[PDB]
């Protein structure tokens, strides 16, 4: 009369984390040049999606490398009603990164210009590397698309200073992405939510630096719905990283 016991590994647990939210998601992990997939929708890992605000990482790299801006420049709020009151202030590229302040990065994208942007995106080989003709929204409503695996590869290269940009520019953009530090761990990353396409896509791409210096990169990608809190992406990421013993 001994009962059975259900054994939850991290694979089953992370799958069920997405099931509990009634949506499809994948979490891509990269460390030591090895990629592992978790979640309830593993086919998302090799599917192209619009990057949404994850593109701000590459926009910043391009703008700094081509000397269209600098890390101390204060981008002025010129008076239009923005999507959030928190965005209605003068701020640096780094503060706009943390706030995901789209209008600051639209101003930067327009300084870069369509020709230089398209050439730099193709030089990097980011996703499908197609930006179309609208310089101020190509990362929000297409035509630019990238897979979660491509995002984890990109962000791990950034973390290791391996992208084809100067070392100082990569270090500066990394500094804009710090989200949390505690107990010798650092978490860097960038959220994204393409709300104006269907299906909506949500992202959280970044990396953990562990106390011994090891880098564990991640790209979370999930289908969003309007009723979800934005923090759902952070919640799913943090619970999964803990289950994986990354933090």
Author numbering: 27 to 273
What does the paper say about this structure?
In the apo-OXA-23 structure, the catalytic lysine residue (Lys73CO2 in the standard class D numbering) is fully carboxylated and sequestered in an internal pocket formed by the side chains of Asn76, Tyr123, and Trp157, as well as the side of helix α3. A sulfate ion is observed in the active site, interacting with the Arg250 side chain. In contrast, apo-OXA-23 and apo-OXA-58 were crystallized at pH 7.5 and 8.5, respectively, where the catalytic Lys73 is carboxylated and the enzymes are active, allowing direct structural comparison of their NA-1-157 complexes.
Of these, the carbapenemase OXA-23 is by far the most common (~70%) in A. baumannii clinical isolates.
